[PDB]
Amino acid sequence: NTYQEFTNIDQAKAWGNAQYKKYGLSKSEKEAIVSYTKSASEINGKLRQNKGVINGFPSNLIKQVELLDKSFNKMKTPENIMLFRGDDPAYLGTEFQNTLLNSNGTINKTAFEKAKAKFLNKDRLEYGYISTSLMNVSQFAGRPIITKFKVAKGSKAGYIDPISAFAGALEMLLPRHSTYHIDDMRLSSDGKQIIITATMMGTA
Numbered sequence: 001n002t003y004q005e006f007t008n009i010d011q012a013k014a015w016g017n018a019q020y021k022k023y024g025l026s027k028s029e030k031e032a033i034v035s036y037t038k039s040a041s042e043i044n045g046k047l048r049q050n051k052g053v054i055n056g057f058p059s060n061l062i063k064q065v066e067l068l069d070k071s072f073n074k075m076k077t078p079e080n081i082m083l084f085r086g087d088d089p090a091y092l093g094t095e096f097q098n099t100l101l102n103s104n105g106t107i108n109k110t111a112f113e114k115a116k117a118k119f120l121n122k123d124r125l126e127y128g129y130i131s132t133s134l135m136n137v138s139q140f141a142g143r144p145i146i147t148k149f150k151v152a153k154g155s156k157a158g159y160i161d162p163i164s165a166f167a168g169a170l171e172m173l174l175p176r177h178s179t180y181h182i183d184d185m186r187l188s189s190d191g192k193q194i195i196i197t198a199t200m201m202g203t204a
């Protein structure tokens with residue numbers, strides 16, 4: 001139908017803060033999210049490497065994932081919304097690690113055609129959590145791949161920004177084991193980035 005796309009920083013900010021007041025996260029859930037923002041790539045990366053299974057993990061890490069998953073029972077979005085995200089070349093596969101980018105900073109049109117073939121009109125399963133923003137913010141917009149996610153109403157999604165260890169991200173978190181369908185993939189006006197548009201679905 002129509003996804004709300006925030007255009008103004010101070011509005012997104014207010015809307016998001018308006019959601020956070022309602023969540024009533026347990027003190028325990030809050031300590032688990034704070035810690036996630038300080039260590040996302042470690043956690044998301046173990047999740048990827050053991051394809052979801054958390055039995056090997058230390059007893060702390062298991063306490064932290066269970067609390068993150070639980071959190072989303074309190075955190076859902078009240079309307080259709082667009083979230084944004086930036087990624088580096090490895091996002092597409094090891095093959096694109098050292099080939100997606102030319103020497104001047106442009107997207108190698110060939111790798112783009114390969115990636116488009118490999119991902120366009122297909123589902124992707126992400127084993128880790130997905131961190132996003134309410135807009136294309138300055139910091140993560142410098143990255144070569146920008147993904148705009150369509151998130152439906154009532155879907156699991158949470159504005160954790162207020163208790164993030166870091167600033168300027170307008171951060172919305174989505175749950176792990178989420179799956180999304182990629183609808184479009186083109187280049188930006190200057191050819192320095194790929195814009196992926198994707199439809200978000202559930203978890204497991």
Ligand SMILES: NC(=O)c1ccc[n+]([C@@H]2O[C@H](COP(=O)([O-])OP(=O)(O)OC[C@H]3O[C@@H](n4cnc5c(N)ncnc54)[C@H](O)[C@@H]3O)[C@@H](O)[C@H]2O)c1
Binds near residue numbers: 048084133140170
């Ligand atoms: N990236 C964003 O759009 C965004 C938005 C808001 C907040 N954040 C915050 O920044 C930090 C999170 O960083 P992140 O999002 O880069 O961590 P991540 O765990 O999602 O990804 C880390 C690195 O691995 C890549 N990657 C992602 N999925 C992959 C996959 N399936 N296979 C191989 N590589 C993959 C990413 O492009 C990045 O280079 C946290 O502090 C979080 O709060 C990020």
